[PDB]
Design a binder for this molecule. Sequence first.
Ligand SMILES: CC(=O)N[C@@H]1[C@@H](O)[C@H](O[C@@H]2O[C@H](CO)[C@@H](O[C@H]3O[C@H](CO)[C@@H](O[C@@H]4O[C@H](CO)[C@@H](OC5O[C@H](CO)[C@@H](O[C@@H]6O[C@H](CO)[C@@H](O)[C@H](O)[C@H]6NC(C)=O)[C@H](O)[C@H]5NC(C)=O)[C@H](O)[C@H]4NC(C)=O)[C@H](O)[C@H]3NC(C)=O)[C@H](O)[C@H]2NC(C)=O)[C@@H](CO)O[C@H]1O
Ligand SMILES: *[C@@H]1O[C@H](CO)[C@@H](O[C@H]2O[C@H](CO)[C@@H](O[C@@H]3O[C@H](CO)[C@@H](O[C@H]4O[C@H](CO)[C@@H](O[C@@H]5O[C@H](CO)[C@@H](O)[C@H](O)[C@@H]5O)[C@H](O)[C@@H]4O)[C@H](O)[C@@H]3O)[C@H](O)[C@H]2NC(C)=O)[C@H](O)[C@H]1NC(C)=O
Length: 361
Amino acid sequence: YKLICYYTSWSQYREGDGSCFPDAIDPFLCTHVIYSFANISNNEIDTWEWNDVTLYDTLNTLKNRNPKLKTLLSVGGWNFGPERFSKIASKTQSRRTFIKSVPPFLRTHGFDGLDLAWLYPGRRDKRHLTALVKEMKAEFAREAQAGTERLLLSAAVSAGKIAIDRGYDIAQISRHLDFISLLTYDFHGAWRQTVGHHSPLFRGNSDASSRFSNADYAVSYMLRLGAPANKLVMGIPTFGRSFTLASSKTDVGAPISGPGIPGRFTKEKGILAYYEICDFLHGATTHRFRDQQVPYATKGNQWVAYDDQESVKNKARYLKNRQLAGAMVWALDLDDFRGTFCGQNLTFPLTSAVKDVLARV
Ligand SMILES: CC(=O)N[C@@H]1[C@@H](O)[C@H](O[C@@H]2O[C@H](CO)[C@@H](O[C@H]3O[C@H](CO)[C@@H](O[C@@H]4O[C@H](CO)[C@@H](OC5O[C@H](CO)[C@@H](O[C@@H]6O[C@H](CO)[C@@H](O)[C@H](O)[C@H]6NC(C)=O)[C@H](O)[C@H]5NC(C)=O)[C@H](O)[C@H]4NC(C)=O)[C@H](O)[C@H]3NC(C)=O)[C@H](O)[C@H]2NC(C)=O)[C@@H](CO)O[C@H]1O
Ligand SMILES: *[C@@H]1O[C@H](CO)[C@@H](O[C@H]2O[C@H](CO)[C@@H](O[C@@H]3O[C@H](CO)[C@@H](O[C@H]4O[C@H](CO)[C@@H](O[C@@H]5O[C@H](CO)[C@@H](O)[C@H](O)[C@@H]5O)[C@H](O)[C@@H]4O)[C@H](O)[C@@H]3O)[C@H](O)[C@H]2NC(C)=O)[C@H](O)[C@H]1NC(C)=O
């Protein structure tokens, strides 16, 4: 089984214990570690943070301890505009320029592959996404002739049905990608005023609409569209999504006034790192959706939908039972990487719980 783990560039800037450097990563925890995110300047792959070359170097030294470890650099991300990806992929000339700049960059910094995070391709983009993937793969095969191990090519894909039908030719890109990470955790649309879980495993027998918004449907659908199970990787969040309640009602369908207040270290309305959630739990009321199989908590006017060791182990067993290629974790820096916030003196409790399940066959 594969254990794909993301590390974010900006996590280095968090205060105190929140600060996380590649250096804090257990070399034997994951099979693949993806650095997020690379940028695109003058139609060429480029660094993002001022100290990326230094951090790139720090992350890739981990392979001195675990020779089997594979690293990839991810391009795109949610802060990188989709229009930019769209513009580059639409013109064969700007697309070929981008493609050619990649292998040399990956080789200079010691990466074993490239991860595509175009979020997201629209109706007019579908055909070009396919061309981009296909041509990028062809360049990697051509570059391997130089005698060095062929670079890997992956992509992070939306788990929402409408998004899938709109911009992806799954059957086509599946044959060129080494693996596909399903983003099965942004299911509760940032649009409306209700409380809900962002990463439920199952539908939840007490609802009619949006049967599409849960990991199980997304996986089944991808398999139905043509994606082979041995190339599919299921995303498991290491963060939670918070809400500020508009009333004293704390259960399903309860009214929402907006995102939950920022975390002390994460400082971003709407989300909390798992290590922040562990602190938040003290004095909170914990509940669990039996049907969906995921937990949530409340304290004051704050409502949090998250994943714990149990929900995460549960998702890992599901993935195995369906014979998928493995799991993807977003993100190492949001897990209790120091092992000092969540009780158990265990480092990376969430990612470890997944690994343990994956290891038992
Ligand atoms: C919110 C929403 O609606 N979007 C949903 C998506 O999240 C989701 O996408 C997939 O799933 C995850 C999680 O859901 C996505 O989110 C992540 O990806 C985004 C990046 O593309 C993250 O955005 C960033 O936010 C951070 C924190 O606020 C940004 O902040 C900072 O970065 C700057 C610039 O680099 C730092 O600068 C430095 O500051 C120092 C002093 O201030 C200087 O000394 C230093 O020199 C200076 N700059 C230099 C030189 O570099 C700031 O310090 C730093 N911090 C602050 C002030 O807070 C970060 O830059 C943003 N990212 C980018 C690329 O711009 C987002 O936060 C993150 N979320 C989480 C929870 O981690 C992923 O994008 C995506 N996952 C994958 C696989 O790619 C989708 C569903 O998939 O749903 C969307 O609705
Ligand atoms: C990741 O990679 C991206 C892509 O390379 C990179 O982009 C930024 O790069 C440079 C460096 O910071 C920026 O430089 C500026 O680019 C803008 C182009 O958008 C230039 O003009 C802007 O400002 C004008 C007003 O000041 C605007 O108005 C114009 O006015 C003139 C007259 O003065 C008229 O003749 C025009 O018709 C027009 O009305 C104009 O619309 C424009 O917005 C500016 O001079 C300068 O060169 C870019 O801004 C960035 N590129 C973009 C955004 O397209 C990122 O830096 C990289 N990311 C990281 C974190 O590294």
